[PDB]
């Protein structure tokens, strides 16, 4: 009789359960409370899901699948699909006017998967994560989707559940889930909520109205290809140029070196949300040469200042599309791992003339938290 | 007086003497025919040189000095110095546009040493090693330097001798010393010699012409930061990841654990030059947990395949810069401890279409051997 809440995110997924009047965000077998939305197929024929899949991307780039959420429930002709497939390192082929993911599954075998079949494997891992913690079977979930997801995208997400042996009882909007997490449904009267959702690869801004516990998505905007990955990319460019200046070595050719730098840049960025300097040190980086540079928050902000500023444009556009002033916003909800960046928090607060956002919930767990609350009601 | 030949190497040094019509490589107080180019200052005010210095590095990282050869006779502004100081665990400070090593010498006192003062202490140890075996004082030496060393680096090496109470009668090029050890100086006609020198931290390739006993260094190349250290690091990374997978323990945090693994990895690598498997076993490795893994030559080669292949590029480059073809190479000389690796010997031989290298001289001792022959002539 257990119903879990699942954030099926673009780069990470999160599972929670309402138990003893509180939401418990469930840590996976590695002790991580979020799991990469990654699936890998080894030459030996082993299926890897989550951390294991992400950690062997560099050695297995063609048969490591991610960003299936970009393709799920879309037609081949969708301009979004035509753009995305050019940048995914695994083969995407057209069958029956739909994108399919073609991978080597080992034993000289190729297999073509629908995007919802890949998402099904991610949901299987989140289901197994919940089962291990509770010590019983989990066959029911509330799953979250972007507010702008159409009927076909919502149905494909339910289908992912069915393939994974989950009854997806309700599909709920990500910004609504975030609002529920902060108990903004339990607010009395009519309130305008601005949800600012910045993840690994996507930026979503949503204007919600709440009226006596009923939510309405009034307007949505953002950038489908702006997230934390882009902030990493700006730092990567900087240090690749700086390394060539200092040592004379060009590392762009060496995938191993670039991969090692990307890992340490990601780590450095995360640290710079809670401290002002982060040391990037890599032993035997390139031709036996070592890498050592300190990234300051100032430098990180400088390298990304235009990208950070650009997040305000979709906020102004949802206010315009909603026929609202910045004074009409009653609640600001910042969710997604990238909203941890102090400069992002500063720019949003400055935009709303010093108005503090909602706080108390882990921003990369907030969507799953909301799903878990709704899952609790259905349980 | 008796003139000794000294290989003053980056990581190891070696002293030889010509006596009874043969070179004798002199074993130190511990019975080792090579001595670590290491100096350590204890809190008690004791100055340790060689084996003793290297053995207490883990407990005394800030006041254990090594790789002085990377700094000797260089200016502060030298791009080489600016890179290297970032990866040395002891303090390097600028005085009078030059690098100086600052260390705690005990009794609440700090002392700044020029690189040549640290090398002087290494030469003092090699001097005492020779004096003990000979039973008389040694005040004359021939010392080897890399072929690419400039006037300042050569003069600073002579200065290191003077500080140690040695008259450095001649500074000879390391690849020339290697060639002299194999008696290639006593060949009639104009021969082209490829010297492939792979040590603990450095890779040097030299094209020498020998014309009836007169040497010319025609071209030099290699990788200033590629050596045996890097091959260890590739194995270290593998086993740190494997241990985490099998036990759930992350050992990067514990310097004690990492130090123990590095020691056994170094021993395992050495064994894999003469056998196909090496057992790495550490009792109470991490929080009382033990470590047991077998390293095969195959796995060692796989982890380092790109680094090993990379050593062929500088060989092709010296041929190009010398306006010579592979077929023009008359002698191949492999020196340095890392040339013991079978895969390295295979790649060089395959590069030169099955041409066997010079053999008979211990590759660890070949440079010191050559220095000793030249020292024997000046005697
Ligand atoms: N402390 C932090 N500082 C900066 N960025 C962070 C921090 N923690 C996580 N992130 C970023 O959050 C992004 C992931 O967002 P998340 O909401 O977890 O995933 P998704 O992309 O699936 O929405 C990544 O780009 C990651 O680098
Ligand atoms: N049998 C062996 N197999 C592989 N590497 C070896 C072997 N013996 C020594 N080495 C390596 O040789 C390196 C030392 O090279 P050497 O020429 O003695 O010193 P230096 O670094 O001063 O040139 C170390 O990295 C050591 O691990
Ligand atoms: Ca992007
Ligand atoms: Ca190195
Ligand atoms: Ca997210
Ligand atoms: Ca050497």
Numbering used by the authors:
A (entry chain B), B (entry chain A): 28 to 406
Paper passage:
Like typical Hsp70s, BiP consists of an N-terminal nucleotide binding domain (NBD) and C-terminal substrate binding domain (SBD) connected by a hydrophobic linker peptide. In the ATP-bound state, the NBD and SBD are docked against each other and the SBD adopts an open conformation, allowing fast exchange of substrates. ATP hydrolysis to ADP causes domain undocking and closure of the SBD, leading to tight substrate binding. Nucleotide exchange resets the cycle and triggers substrate release.
To establish if the selective effect of Ca2+ on ADP binding to BiP is reflected in the structure of the complex, we purified the NBDs of mammalian BiP, Hsp70, and Hsc70 and co-crystallised them with Ca2+ and ADP. In each case, additional density in the nucleotide-binding cleft indicated occupancy by ADP and the overall conformations of the three NBDs were very similar. Overlay of the BiP(NBD) structure with the Hsp70(NBD) and Hsc70(NBD) structures revealed root-mean-squared deviations (RMSD) of 0.769 Å and 0.734 Å over the Cα alignment, respectively. Moreover, in each structure, Ca2+ was identified in the nucleotide- binding cleft, where it formed contacts to both phosphate groups (α and β) of the nucleotide as well as indirect contacts to protein residues via several water molecules (inset). The position of the Ca2+ ion and the coordinated water molecules were nearly identical in all three complexes and similar to a previously reported lower resolution structure of human BiP bound to CaADP. The BiP(NBD)•Ca2+•ADP complex also resembled the structures of BiP(NBD)apo and the NBD of BiPapo containing both its NBD and SBD. The Ca2+ ion in a structure of human Hsp70(NBD) in complex with Ca2+, ADP, and Pi occupies the same position as Mg2+ in a post-hydrolysis state NBD structure. Together, these findings reveal that Ca2+ participates in the coordination of ADP in the NBD, which is consistent with cooperative binding of Ca2+ and nucleotide to BiP. The NBD structures also revealed a second, surface-exposed Ca2+ ion that is coordinated by the carboxyl group of D257 and backbone carbonyl of H252 in BiP and homologous residues in the cytosolic Hsp70s. Ca2+ binding to this second site is likely an experimental artefact favoured by the high [Ca2+] in the crystallisation solution and crystal packing. However, the IC50 values for Ca2+-dependent inhibition of MABA-ADP release from the NBDs of Hsp70 (444.7 ± 80.5 µM) and Hsc70 (345.5 ± 71.1 µM) were much higher than from the NBD of BiP (57.1 ± 7.4 µM).
